[PDB]
Design a protein around this motif. Structure first.
Motif, PDB file in Angstrom:
ATOM      1  N   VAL A 187      47.255  35.546  -7.891  1.00  0.00           N
ATOM      2  CA  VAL A 187      46.231  35.278  -8.896  1.00  0.00           C
ATOM      3  C   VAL A 187      46.921  35.304 -10.247  1.00  0.00           C
ATOM      4  O   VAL A 187      48.029  35.816 -10.390  1.00  0.00           O
ATOM      5  N   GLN A 197      45.538  38.790 -16.020  1.00  0.00           N
ATOM      6  CA  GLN A 197      44.732  38.620 -17.219  1.00  0.00           C
ATOM      7  C   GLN A 197      45.253  39.504 -18.347  1.00  0.00           C
ATOM      8  O   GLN A 197      45.758  40.606 -18.113  1.00  0.00           O
ATOM      9  N   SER A 233      43.576  44.030 -11.810  1.00  0.00           N
ATOM     10  CA  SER A 233      43.512  42.622 -12.157  1.00  0.00           C
ATOM     11  C   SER A 233      44.406  41.747 -11.290  1.00  0.00           C
ATOM     12  O   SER A 233      44.076  40.579 -11.043  1.00  0.00           O
ATOM     13  N   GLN A 269      36.900  32.242  -4.215  1.00  0.00           N
ATOM     14  CA  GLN A 269      37.239  31.324  -5.302  1.00  0.00           C
ATOM     15  C   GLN A 269      36.888  31.861  -6.687  1.00  0.00           C
ATOM     16  O   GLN A 269      37.239  31.225  -7.682  1.00  0.00           O
ATOM     17  N   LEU A 325      38.316  34.293  -7.874  1.00  0.00           N
ATOM     18  CA  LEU A 325      39.534  34.944  -8.332  1.00  0.00           C
ATOM     19  C   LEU A 325      40.314  33.965  -9.188  1.00  0.00           C
ATOM     20  O   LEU A 325      40.523  32.809  -8.805  1.00  0.00           O
ATOM     21  N   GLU A 326      40.717  34.426 -10.359  1.00  0.00           N
ATOM     22  CA  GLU A 326      41.278  33.544 -11.368  1.00  0.00           C
ATOM     23  C   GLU A 326      42.632  33.017 -10.910  1.00  0.00           C
ATOM     24  O   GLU A 326      43.559  33.797 -10.681  1.00  0.00           O
ATOM     25  N   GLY A 327      42.738  31.696 -10.775  1.00  0.00           N
ATOM     26  CA  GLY A 327      43.985  31.068 -10.383  1.00  0.00           C
ATOM     27  C   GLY A 327      44.447  31.431  -8.988  1.00  0.00           C
ATOM     28  O   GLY A 327      45.659  31.475  -8.729  1.00  0.00           O
TER      29      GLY A 327
END
Ligand SMILES: [Br-]
Length: 208
Positions: free
Chosen positions: A146, A149, A157, A179, A181-183
């Motif tokens: 991921v 951040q 994170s 989905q 989850l960031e990246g």
């Protein structure tokens, strides 16, 4: 695929607090002995004033301490996790799958790594040396990534979403359900090890 975004954000998170990169490697080498690490010991290894060791650790909010306030966990940890990191028969642990791929080069040791597929609970293991991975079981083993951040607790994170999986298709099946989850991206463990090598190369550059 293309892993520059992950390398970029991992480096930025280490270089965001001055001192972190310079403290990380000496601390990891000390923790790899398998004993808690005092701030005084660390200051002596770094040749830093105690107040500077303190200020750096203050910004590293996921740092784990024992009952005496010794450091016992910073990526590599003495406290049990899902990621077993064995060196010279000392059983240590890691916060995430990618940590187990990065640390051997930084501490100059080979590790027997083991975990469980986060999708199926199947056992997974491999041997990670500073230069290569061997005995990859299963051979198609995969890793989730991921995007870290800004100014977020790095372990909640990033580490908590970076797992081993039995296979790329198993991981993509799992990934379809996560989905938010960031990246979020699924790569082979070989791709993840290559990401670790690029991180480590840049890391050693930026050290004093
Ligand atoms: Br890219």
């Amino acid at each position: 695929m293309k892993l520059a975004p992950y390398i970029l954000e991992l480096l930025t998170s280490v270089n965001r607090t001055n001192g972190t990169a310079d403290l990380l490697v000496p601390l990891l080498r000390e923790l790899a002995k398998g004993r808690p690490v005092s701030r005084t010991t660390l200051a002596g290894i770094l040749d830093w004033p105690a107040e500077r060791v303190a200020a750096v650790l203050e910004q590293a909010t996921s740092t784990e301490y024992d009952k005496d306030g010794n450091i016992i966990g910073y990526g590599l940890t003495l406290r049990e996790t899902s990621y077993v990191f064995e060196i010279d028969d000392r059983r240590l642990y890691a916060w995430c799958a990618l940590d187990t791929l990065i640390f051997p080069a930084l501490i100059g040791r080979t590790a027997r790594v083991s975990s469980h597929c986060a999708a199926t609970g199947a056992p997974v293991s491999l041997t990670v040396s500073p230069s290569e991975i061997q005995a990859v079981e299963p051979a198609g083993m995969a890793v989730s990534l991921v995007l870290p951040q800004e100014a977020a607790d790095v372990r909640q994170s990033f580490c908590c979403h970076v797992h081993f999986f039995a296979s790329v298709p198993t991981a993509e099946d799992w990934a379809s359900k996560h989905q938010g989850l960031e990246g979020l991206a699924i790569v082979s463990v070989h791709e993840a090890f290559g990401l670790g090598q690029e991180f480590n190369r840049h890391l050693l550059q930026t050290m004093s």
